[PDB]
From a paper:
We dissected the molecular structure and crystal lattice arrangement of mNb‐WT by single crystal X‐ray diffraction. mNb‐WT protein molecules were arranged in the P1 lattice inside the lamellar crystals with two protein molecules as one asymmetric unit. Up to a 1.27 Å resolution, we could clearly see the participation of water and sulfate ions during crystal packing in the solvent. Water molecules mediate a strong hydrogen bond network to stabilize two protein molecules inside the asymmetric unit (interface a). Meanwhile, the sulfate ions also contributed to the protein stability in the crystal lattice, both by affecting the protein itself and by enhancing interactions between two protein molecules that belong to different asymmetric units. In addition to sulfate ions, water still played an essential role in contributing to protein packing in the crystal lattice to various degrees at the contact interfaces among the asymmetric units, such as interface b. Because of the small size and compact structure, mNb‐WT proteins were tightly arranged in the P1 lattice, and the Matthews coefficient was 1.76 Å3/Da, corresponding to ~30% solvent content.
By rationally engineering the surface residues of a model anti‐VEGF nanobody, we obtained a series of anti‐VEGF nanobodies with identical protein structures and VEGF binding affinities, while drastically different crystallization propensities and crystal lattice structures. Anti‐VEGF proteins have been the cornerstone of wet AMD therapeutics, and approved anti‐VEGF proteins include ranibizumab, aflibercept, conbercept, brolucizumab, and bevacizumab (off‐label use). Here, we successfully changed the crystal lattice arrangement of therapeutic nanobody (termed mNb‐WT) by rational mutations of surface residues, which remarkably reduced the dissolution rate of protein molecules from the crystal into the solvent. In summary, our findings demonstrated that the protein crystalline form can be modulated by rational surface mutation without impairing pharmaceutical efficacy.
Author numbering: 5 to 126
Write the structure that this text describes.
């Protein structure tokens, strides 16, 4: 898995990240985004099931949405209304698990990318 799109962005703007997977088995995985902000433990961000259904983090205020394009082996994270506290390394992960509350847990996932840094600053 390879995440892309990180950079320096102004508060209030939006940013789209993507993650591309190798191989032929992309459609067989649910995909989840997590982040590691400086000085914090890993946080679940948002996930998408094999069928395309969104699973939101229990406290991230709806600002993070997700889509997948199976023909391109790619999943997308859209962050709206960026805040300084969104500064973090963002990771995407794959799991064979079906859509359920387990998609909000890191241990459910089998493969992880190397991450992409998002910095939000005025």
């Amino acid at each position: 898995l390879v995440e892309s799109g990180g950079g320096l962005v102004q508060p209030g703007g939006s940013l789209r990240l993507s993650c591309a997977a190798s191989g032929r088995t992309f459609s067989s995985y649910s995909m989840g985004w997590f982040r590691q902000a400086p000085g914090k433990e890993r946080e679940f961000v948002v996930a998408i099931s094999k069928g395309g259904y969104k699973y939101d983090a229990v406290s991230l205020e709806g600002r993070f949405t997700i889509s997948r394009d199976n023909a391109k082996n790619t999943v997308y994270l859209q962050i709206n209304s960026l805040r300084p506290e969104d500064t973090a390394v963002y990771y995407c992960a794959s799991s064979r698990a079906y859509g359920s509350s387990r998609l909000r847990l890191a241990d459910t996932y089998e493969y992880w990318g190397q991450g992409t840094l998002v910095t939000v600053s005025s």
